[PDB]
Every structure is written in structure tokens, then in C-alpha cells.
Design a protein around this ligand. Structure first.
Ligand SMILES: COc1ccc(NC(=O)Nc2ccncc2)cc1
Ligand SMILES: COc1ccc(NC(=O)Nc2ccncc2)cc1
Ligand SMILES: [Ca+2]
Ligand SMILES: [Ca+2]
Lengths: 204, 204
């Protein structure tokens, strides 16, 4: 009875890990497709499964960081969303912190995404008329040539500057989508998706 | 690409059905063991998975009703919880409505549970000093010999009456736990739990 409860708890922890990987895969696919409502619903399911986790491997921590990173990027223009205990941290700044924590290769795409999030963290403040907040985000991030150009834009209040059109929010989204495609290909072979695909294919 | 998206959506619907059955099984086990916090966390996960459902079979509707029924029973003494659009319906009255809707055998245990929920729906109002609400719950439910005894208790405001000690909240819980044991035995062979148990047993 005591050892049976233990085997039951271990089996629940295995099933939760399979559910976490599947929801991360579904969250990446909805992010890549731009299916906003499916992303919202899947995010809610991933948050609940994470709250119930019995144990955590290094691979599961990376999966959690990936889900949290996409959530913050999706909320990038929602300056009223508070992702940290420090109420001053904006969603794109929270995404930047997670990006610097994930155990992943720092290839050229990694740095391109990092720099696009840095520029957009300032740009989204400027677009809403939050000029003082843009300077505070800049000070927190910066903690150059690129750096001095950004401070000049903030001081001029040049919201629709050509610089933000070349290093745009859409460009940040497209570079993140390229990374998401790699995560999708990697997690497509996880247990629950493979088993579900086999059931579907067998009925075809 | 269009047919690939379709196969992907079908596979996600299969995986969601497997997750729903597993969470119902975990919810039943936590209810049976009296693990209140595990029940709360599992309930949150089941609610999120239900909100994301792509399709629904008669078996999945029964599983949803089972989860909702246990939630209402667990909230039976929380008269501030509103489970219906009509704000007047108490949690045990909401549990009674679901109990009368589930496609299940109406054996002796079914009726014993039904009658215990009816008595306790009044008893929980009386225990909180809600004498007028107890009469309103009685009118909604009733909609005898048992019936006339209850109206007499409500009019006398006899909160700690011997009748409520014989048809007690604990007795209602124990009868519901006997039904939960049957649901647990039936759902123990569902895909995700069977596959997780095999992984655990293989490492022993
Ligand atoms: C970066 O954000 C998060 C990181 C980790 C968790 N959860 C977590 O560590 N849970 C856990 C459960 C049981 N054993 C060990 C660990 C939640 C959020
Ligand atoms: C008794 O409470 C509930 C009953 C059913 C649902 N969901 C539901 O019917 N979803 C669905 C999704 C796609 N195709 C058909 C149906 C939710 C709550
Ligand atoms: Ca704000
Ligand atoms: Ca109330």
C-alpha cells in the first residue's frame, strides 16, 4: 500500500513529463502558425501541468523556459502584464532574461534574436508614448554603436524612426519563428505526439 | 500542408483525450485519499485540458461530468462558490444535477448517494445559520416521510439534529468514495497510466 502509492506517484510524474513535452510542442506550433486563441488555451494547460510537477530534469527546465519565453514574446506589446515580482520589468525584458538562461547553443541566430528583443523592448515603450519608461528599459538592458543610436532615438522621442523599421517587431517574430521551427522538429518525436500520430495514421 | 495540419489537429485531439482520462484518474485518486492540495492542482489541469478539447465522445462527456461532480462535492461546504449561471444554486445542488445526468447505472448505491446529497444540501445551510436558504434549497430539491422530517428540522432550526448525524457529511463522502473506487479501477487501464506504469515497473 505504501510502495503501491510510491509506484503510483512515480507513474504520475512520468505522465506529467509526457504532458509537458506535448503541450510545449503544441504551444510552439500555435506560436509559429499565429493561432492566438489556441496559443492562449495551450498556455493555460502548460501552466497548470507545470504547477503539478513532482520532479524536474535539466531537459524539463529547458522545456519550461521555452514555454515561458514564447508567452512573454506573445505578450511583448502588453505593457500592463507583470511577469516578474519586480513590477518594473516589461514582458520583452523578462523574455530577454529567460533567453540568456536557457541551456542552448549561442549560435548567430541566438544573438540576432537577443539583439532584436533588446531594440524592441525600447521600441514598444516609445510606441505607447512611454518615453521615460523607454529610458529606464534602456538603462536596465544596456549596461557602443548600436547603444548610442538607441539613446539618441529615445531623447528625440523619434517613435517611427527608420531604425525600428529595419529591426522591427515583425523581424523579431520571424527570427524567433526560425528557432521555434527547430524546437518543433526536435519535439515532434516526443512520446505522446508519436503515439497520437500512430493512432491517427492507422485510421487513414 | 493543409492535410498535414489536419492530421496534426487529429493527433492533438487524440492526445487531449488521453490527458483528460489520466487527469480524471488522478483526480479520483486524490479525492479518495483526501489529498486536498493534489486535488486542487489536478482540478486546475483538468479544467484547462477540457477548455482546449477539439471533439467530444459520450465516454468523454461522462469523464467530464465525473470531474465536475467531485469538484462540487469537494466544495460542498463552500456556500460562496457559484457553479451555475443562476447564482442561487449551491455546490451540493449543482452536484445533484450532474449526478442525475451521468449515463450510469441507477443501482442502490446511486440512490443512496443521491439521497445523502439531498439531505446534506439542507444540512450545510443550517450549519452556517442560513435557515431561509435551507428552506429554498428544500423547495428546489423536494418537488414523503423523509421530506416531511426535513421540513420539520428546517422550521425548528434544529442544526445539530440526530437525523443529520445518521445521514452525515462523512457518510455522504464514504458512499461517494465507494463509487470513486469503481471509477478508479475502470480508468486504471487507460493509455497514459498504463504506459507510465510500464515505464516505472521496467526500472524496478
Ligand atoms: C523557471 O521557472 C520554473 C522553474 C521550475 C519550476 N518548477 C520546479 O522546479 N518544480 C519542481 C518540482 C519537483 N521537484 C523539483 C522541481 C517552475 C517554474
Ligand atoms: C458538462 O460540461 C461540459 C460539457 C462539454 C464540454 N465541452 C464540449 O462539449 N466540447 C466540445 C468540443 C468540440 N466538439 C464538441 C464538443 C464542456 C463542459
Ligand atoms: Ca506597465
Ligand atoms: Ca452563497
Amino acid at each position: 500500500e505504501e510502495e503501491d502509492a510510491g509506484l503510483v506517484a512515480e507513474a504520475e510524474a512520468v505522465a506529467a513529463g509526457w504532458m509537458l513535452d506535448f503541450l510545449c510542442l503544441s504551444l510552439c506550433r500555435a506560436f509559429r502558425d499565429g493561432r492566438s486563441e489556441d496559443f492562449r488555451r495551450t498556455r493555460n494547460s502548460a501552466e497548470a501541468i507545470i504547477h503539478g510537477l513532482s520532479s524536474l530534469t535539466a531537459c524539463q527546465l529547458r522545456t519550461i523556459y521555452i514555454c515561458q519565453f514564447l508567452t512573454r514574446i506573445a505578450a511583448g506589446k502588453t505593457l500592463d502584464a507583470q511577469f516578474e515580482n519586480d513590477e518594473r520589468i516589461t514582458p520583452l525584458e523578462s523574455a530577454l532574461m529567460i533567453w540568456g538562461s536557457i541551456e542552448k547553443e549561442h549560435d548567430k541566430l541566438h544573438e540576432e534574436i537577443q539583439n532584436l528583443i533588446k531594440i524592441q523592448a525600447i521600441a514598444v515603450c516609445m510606441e505607447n508614448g512611454n518615453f521615460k519608461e523607454a529610458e529606464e528599459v534602456f538603462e536596465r538592458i544596456f549596461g557602443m554603436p548600436f547603444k548610442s543610436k538607441l539613446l539618441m532615438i529615445i531623447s528625440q522621442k523619434d517613435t517611427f524612426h527608420s531604425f525600428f523599421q529595419h529591426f522591427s517587431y515583425n523581424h523579431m517574430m520571424e527570427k524567433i519563428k526560425s528557432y521555434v521551427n527547430y524546437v518543433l522538429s526536435e519535439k515532434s518525436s516526443t512520446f505522446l505526439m508519436k503515439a497520437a500520430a500512430k493512432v491517427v495514421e492507422s485510421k487513414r
